[PDB]
């Protein structure tokens, strides 16, 4: 199975099969799995919670809606001592989008710095152009609250 | 077979469910639910379009550690409500696991005590009864919250 990639402390990214290995996630301390898909089956691991963000890897779909509620869940899981695994089918677009959204919202990065952080961990990271624009709107809105 | 209705309102933007809420997609949409909290290892949730689902994987068993999941669970629920949505917490019987999560959330994010939070749950769902293990964990949670 492909490894999990540690994006940042208590933050992991993976492809779909990487979320199936119960032993990796236990090794990584993963307590919450964010499954950014509509069909991929998520963790079976005893005691690993799962949040499903149901989107196709598709510039039409509205991933912007789910960012703030998904990020709140993840930050809570980390502040309580756990860690998060964000996965999609390829570990390239949807999971990349949520990870950078998390880093902007809770680690106070700009979209550029945050995404450079995801890329360094995961070179193939590439949100489709629709998501990439939704993340700029997230940044816009974050700036205005901040 | 589980006690009806499928959905009960426990508090503004907070609904409890039994298994029969798995086929109540229309009632969900009425109630503007934007997040389902499935508190089971094995139960299915409603297939509500683009509604997020959080699974809190525990059996209705006094040895299951629900306490460990309350913070990300309660945090997801609040963020959905703060965003203007509603939450549906559902378990198979709508009695133990979903009740205890509803109690927890009220304590954590609406500052209610454990006497008042559970009262609201029981009052909306008269059969509600977390198993003794879940009740101990809830008691433990109220102490952690009164200290913090
Ligand atoms: Cl900044
Ligand atoms: Cl890019
Ligand atoms: Cl179950």
Author numbering:
A (entry chain B): 16 to 161
B (entry chain A): 13 to 160
In the authors' words:
Dual-specificity phosphatases (DUSPs), which are known to remove a phosphate group from both phosphotyrosine and phosphoserine/threonine, constitute a large subfamily of PTPs. DUSP28, also known as VHP, is a member of the subfamily of atypical DUSPs and contains a single catalytic domain, whose precise biological functions and enzymatic characteristics are largely unknown. The DUSP28 monomer adopts a canonical DUSP fold composed of the core region (β1–β5 and α2–α5) and two mid-domain variations: α1' and α1. To the authors' surprise, DUSP28 has an only partially exposed active site pocket and exceptionally low phosphatase activity, which together differentiate this protein from other DUSPs.
Another unique feature of the PTP signature motif of DUSP28 is that the residue immediately preceding the catalytic cysteine is tyrosine, in contrast to all the other human DUSP proteins, which contain a histidine residue at this position. To verify whether substitution of Tyr102 with a canonical histidine residue can cause structural changes to DUSP28 and improve its phosphatase activity, a mutant DUSP28 protein containing the Tyr102His mutation, referred to as DUSP28(Y102H), was prepared and subjected to crystallization. We obtained DUSP28(Y102H) crystals in the nearly the same condition to that of DUSP28 crystals, and its structure was finally determined to 2.4 Å resolution. Although the crystal structure of DUSP28(Y102H) was fairly well matched to that of DUSP28 when superimposed, with an RMSD of 0.50 Å over 147 aligned residues, the Tyr102His substitution was revealed to result in noticeable conformational change of residues Ala33−Ala34 and Gly57−Pro61. These residues are in contact with Tyr102 in the original crystal structure, clearly supporting the structural role of Tyr102 in sustaining the DUSP28 protein fold. Nevertheless, the main chain carbonyl-attracting hydrogen bond is not shown in the DUSP28(Y102H) structure as was in the DUSP28 structure, consistently with the nearly identical dihedral angles of the C103S residue from DUSP28 and DUSP28(Y102H). The phosphatase activity of DUSP28 was rather reduced by the Tyr102His mutation, in contrast to the introduction of the Asn105Ala and Arg107Val double-mutation, which considerably improved the enzymatic activity irrespective of the presence of Tyr102. In conclusion, DUSP28 contains a tyrosine instead of histidine at the position ahead of the active site residue, and this tyrosine may play a structural role. On the other hand, this substitution may not be the key determinant of the atypically low activity of DUSP28.
